[PDB]
UniProtKB/Swiss-Prot annotation, chain A:
Binding partners and assembly: Interacts with NISCH. Interacts with PIP5K1A. Interacts with the GTP-bound form of RAB7A. Interacts with SRGAP2. Interacts with CYFIP1/SRA-1. Interacts with PLXNB3. Interacts with ARHGDIA; the interaction is induced by SEMA5A, mediated through PLXNB3 and inactivates and stabilizes RAC1. Interacts (GTP-bound form preferentially) with PKN2 (via the REM repeats); the interaction stimulates autophosphorylation and phosphorylation of PKN2. Interacts with the GEF proteins PREX1, RASGRF2, FARP1, FARP2, DOCK1, DOCK2 and DOCK7, which promote the exchange between GDP and GTP, and therefore activate it.
Gene Ontology molecular functions: enzyme binding; G protein activity; GTP binding; GTP-dependent protein binding; GTPase activity; protein kinase binding; protein-containing complex binding; Rho GDP-dissociation inhibitor binding
Entries under CDD domains matching the protein: Rac1_like (cd01871)
Organism: Homo sapiens
Regulation: Regulated by guanine nucleotide exchange factors (GEFs) which promote the exchange of bound GDP for free GTP, GTPase activating proteins (GAPs) which increase the GTP hydrolysis activity, and GDP dissociation inhibitors which inhibit the dissociation of the nucleotide from the GTPase. GTP hydrolysis is stimulated by ARHGAP30.
Record membrane topology: Lipid-anchor
Tissues of expression: Isoform B is predominantly identified in skin and epithelial tissues from the intestinal tract. Its expression is elevated in colorectal tumors at various stages of neoplastic progression, as compared to their respective adjacent tissues.
Reactions performed catalytically: GTP + H2O = GDP + phosphate + H(+)
Glycan attachment residues as annotated in the record: 32, 35
Gene name of the encoded protein: RAC1
Modification sites for (Microbial infection) O-AMP-threonine: 35
Effect in UniProt of substituting residue 56 to A: Strongly reduced interaction with PLCB2
Name of this chain's protein: Ras-related C3 botulinum toxin substrate 1
From Swiss-Prot, chain B:
Domain DH: 2-177
Compartmental location: Cytoplasm; Cytoplasm, Cytoskeleton
More details: Called DUO because the encoded protein is closely related to but shorter than TRIO.
Family: Belongs to the protein kinase superfamily. CAMK Ser/Thr protein kinase family.
Protein name: Kalirin
Tissues where this protein is expressed: Isoform 2 is brain specific. Highly expressed in cerebral cortex, putamen, amygdala, hippocampus and caudate nucleus. Weakly expressed in brain stem and cerebellum. Isoform 4 is expressed in skeletal muscle.
Source species: Homo sapiens (Human)
Length: 177, 179
């Protein structure tokens, strides 16, 4: 039965850990956001076919450019994430994440994931960004970025509401089959 | 409350890390050193290259560090000192990371399904590769937990900043040591 290594990369601001915890436990962790998500595997059925999905977190490694690639080899699919309410994390897709992922795993599929979808319509978030002469990242921006990096899908999700979250991972699997 | 949750995570994740290294050592490592099973010649007597100094890292955590962290359970604002105390021992993460690429190449090029067979046999969710990234993960994680403590511990927080300093400096040193 088919094994799938999925590595999740992106800035600290994406909430990689929270994402994975919320997907795996079926619930936003709420009270306390743990900093530790240990390498995970579970069976899921996709398009009928059952599959063994491996998830690796990378949080903590954001400042260690030579340590991060230690997780890259033999990856079946990357989730490259940015927070939809951080223009900087978006720009880093282009500036930092796509380059090193391509440099090490040139023929590995990428899903581009916009996180914190629930904050894109939040007045306080919106206002905190307008004060910095910025706005949240909207859909066509994600699409355009995905095109530019050769991402197979651009997907948006919330660890909070679970909106789009199961789909992110369905599609990570579909991109390998 | 937040300081208590973080400490609890530090402790629970430390326990699991010790469990995970132990598991690695007594499955993937033990099969090779045992001499119970058929060992691909491309890796024979190269367990040094595969597992680097993971034994010594496990021994640190299992003999000392976990016991000392436990002592700081009700002292989250002071746990930074634990890292200061035991800083030199963390230098062995530099050696480990330096070696990890060589470990990975070796396993691709010469190990075939040796370790997969062992994984299947023992019923392990984690592959040998999943176990072997863990030291790299763990050594970048401690700084996260210390930063989290800092967001919620008062001006009694130089007993964290030095701890954090240490745990920022170990992974940077490991980073800067890579080819
Ligand atoms: C203004 C600061 N807020 C704290 C964030 C305060 C209000 N608030 C509290 C928790 C919380 C949580 C979300 N939303 C998420 O974390 N979405 C995620 C994460 C990932 C990954 O993907 N989606 C929104 C608002 C919230």
């Amino acid at each position: 039965m088919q094994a799938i290594k999925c590595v999740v990369v992106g800035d600290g601001a994406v909430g990689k850990t929270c994402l994975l915890i919320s997907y795996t436990t079926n619930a936003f962790p709420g009270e306390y956001i743990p900093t530790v998500f240990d390498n995970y595997s579970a069976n899921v059925m996709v398009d009928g076919k059952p599959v063994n999905l491996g998830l690796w977190d990378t949080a903590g490694q954001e400042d260690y450019d030579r340590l991060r690639p230690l997780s890259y080899p033999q990856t079946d699919v990357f989730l490259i994430c940015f927070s939809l309410v951080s223009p900087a994390s978006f720009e880093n897709v282009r500036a930092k994440w796509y380059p090193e992922v391509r440099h090490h795993c040139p023929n590995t599929p990428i899903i581009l994931v916009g996180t914190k979808l629930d904050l894109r319509d939040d007045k306080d978030t919106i206002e905190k960004l307008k004060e910095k002469k910025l706005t949240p990242i909207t859909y066509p921006q994600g699409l355009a970025m995905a095109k530019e990096i050769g991402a197979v899908k651009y997907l948006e999700c919330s660890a909070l509401t679970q909106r789009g979250l199961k789909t992110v991972f369905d599609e990570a699997i579909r991109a390998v089959l | 409350r937040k300081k208590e949750f973080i400490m609890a995570e530090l402790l629970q994740t430390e326990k699991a890390y010790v469990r995970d290294l132990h598991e690695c050592l007594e499955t993937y490592l033990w099969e090779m050193t045992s001499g119970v099973e058929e060992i691909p010649p491309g890796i024979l007597n190269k367990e040094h290259i595969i597992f680097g100094n993971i034994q010594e890292i496990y021994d640190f955590h299992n003999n000392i560090f976990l016991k000392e962290l436990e002592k700081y359970e009700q002292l989250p604002e002071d746990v930074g000192h634990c890292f200061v105390t035991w800083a030199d021992k963390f230098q062995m993460y530099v050696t480990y990371c330096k070696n990890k690429p060589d470990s990975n190449q070796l396993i691709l090029e010469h190990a075939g399904t040796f370790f997969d067979e062992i994984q299947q046999r023992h019923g392990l969710a984690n592959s040998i590769s999943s176990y072997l990234i863990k030291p790299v993960q763990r050594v970048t994680k401690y700084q996260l937990l210390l930063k989290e403590l800092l967001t919620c511990c008062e001006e009694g927080k130089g007993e964290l900043k030095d701890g954090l300093e240490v745990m920022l400096s170990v992974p940077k040193k490991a980073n800067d040591a890579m080819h």
